[PDB]
Amino acid sequence: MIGGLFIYNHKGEVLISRVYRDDIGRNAVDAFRVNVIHARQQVRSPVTNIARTSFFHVKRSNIWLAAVTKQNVNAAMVFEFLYKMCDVMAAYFGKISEENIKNNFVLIYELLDEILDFGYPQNSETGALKTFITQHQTKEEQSQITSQVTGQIGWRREGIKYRRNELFLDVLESVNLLMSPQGQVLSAHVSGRVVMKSYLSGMPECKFGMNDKIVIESMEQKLISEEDLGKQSIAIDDCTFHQCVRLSKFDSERSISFIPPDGEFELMRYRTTKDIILPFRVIPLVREVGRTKLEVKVVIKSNFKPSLLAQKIEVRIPTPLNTSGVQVICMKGKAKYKASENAIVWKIKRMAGMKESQISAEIELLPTNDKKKWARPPISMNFEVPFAPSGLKVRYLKVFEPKLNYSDHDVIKWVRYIGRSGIYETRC
């Protein structure tokens, strides 16, 4: 379906030359190098057309990757394949560099040709790949591999044994927040995923509950149990899944079925663009004194439970560029200034909830605010916080091993709720 797929370094020579079509020419490849790899201009696109020829060439890192084709395809699946490729490269050997490619060359080649033959892309389920795809068959092994291929079950499921059956979850909630510098939450959204680290035997299908259509309602049920009309739980604004789920099962009854693999993985990522909890009440704003002085007023009211303790509190307060006369205000924490970035680093060792530290700033200037003027860099609060902002949490969690012995109770469960607010930026 596709031809050459060539990985490139910075110096531009191939790190691989992995062709899958006749049409592919050396005259083509070196041209691609000297023209994309080398170009006086520097604004480009991961996809490229040169003489009616597509070129999905990407630097997924310092290391590059060129996907050459002259066949109209879905670019999206091409990129999906590129991802899966580099991602499994990492999964099998972590870092991906010169030696990472070299000392894997043969596996690389056989995989690529398999996972994509003449451009026809095959799967990368790696249900048992790395076993025989290892950096010599038996009749049982022959039939075994043949069947596991024919077997419509992946993600490393053959029936495993773990001396215990336990899973540790970690709910990460990334605070996708923009608020008006005068105070109005322009962006109130959250990006979160269910990463699942599991240590269990066998191949269990598991289910799980997370409060739906209502704000939230073996050994520890919950320390923060879902009080009726509890923490923010909403129709998930967008719930994203992974190929263990059964969306047929969902859209039938709003519940997929997932046979999870073992070890760590991301069970389902999700987004909600509403119904969040604010950790502070900051009105960061700047004012200008004719044109000889820019003054910034930063009143950082922190707002959480004082029992909650955020640490290493570093708020980004850009100082005006031209600096003649400084005017500093201190309430609590540590006064730190940032030069070469022209910023008040109101760096505080730690903060409890429901607090307020105000810094008012004046910085004398020289007129440069013209038809082109000062860029107002959003004042941001950056710090540490674990948190269940929505607090949409485990409505239940159904795990088992309905084959031999170990039941629900024979599994010990966990979760973490790690908020993530580095997106706390506003000055303009």
Binding site: L169, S218, M219, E220, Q221, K222, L223, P386, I412, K413, W414, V415, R416, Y417, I418
Partner: peptide
């Protein structure tokens, strides 16, 4: 954050 759950 490092807390036991079930």
């Amino acid at each position: 954050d490092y807390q036991r759950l079930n």
